[PDB]
Symmetry: C3
Subunit: 86 residues, 3 copies
């Protein structure tokens, strides 16, 4: 399908219960998702990322990211636009 766009050295991938795929776009300091059937990726409203290294999603839809370049972990609840720093 080839619809993710503009990735550089992507570092991790997670897939949630709805089949949405999440990718840490390491080389571009962002996290992108692609819903099942979608032809347009969405950049998640994480903020201040630096070379993110990995991602997980739990069964409640919360997305967790290791923000490698900032020595921290951040998370984003499903339907939230505002990250929590862990």
């Amino acid at each position: 399908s080839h619809m993710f766009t503009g990735l550089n050295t992507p570092s991790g991938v997670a897939v949630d219960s709805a089949g949405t795929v999440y990718v840490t776009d390491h080389g571009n300091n962002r996290v992108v998702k692609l819903a099942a059937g979608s032809n347009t990726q969405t950049v998640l409203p994480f903020t201040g990322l630096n070379t993110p290294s990995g991602v997980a999603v739990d069964s409640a839809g919360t997305v967790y990211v290791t923000d490698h370049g900032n020595n921290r972990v951040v998370k984003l609840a499903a339907g939230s636009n505002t990250q929590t720093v862990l």
Copy 2:
């Protein structure tokens, strides 16, 4: 003895499904390997053209997703399929 991963080079990621099958991105060897309960030899999954894969996920249907880091892309492979899809 067997039921061991062999030949791994700078492995980058791991995923496990509820059947207990372990999936590993063998970064240095441009390949993805898995090992199921009761299998004494690992399987190299038939992805194509990988370079330095960085991470892996597996969904409920057993489809394997890989960040093909060296090629700036994500690919997936359904269980038992030999033809990957680029995402």
Copy 3:
């Protein structure tokens, strides 16, 4: 506060149904987990880790780690103090 502390170039993250978060603390050769409910981080008793690159946790609570610097994968069952090399 509810956060990981003392991380260095963290490489990967996993999460379980109870809300526990697990991180490969790559720069410090360790794996740490953070309690869902409190400000408690626990160092898992893996042995000889070297720049670990990734982590997974299964339904039984077994923690799996790609031990990047040692070209191996190791696991630790919930409640065990003894890792198994895969």
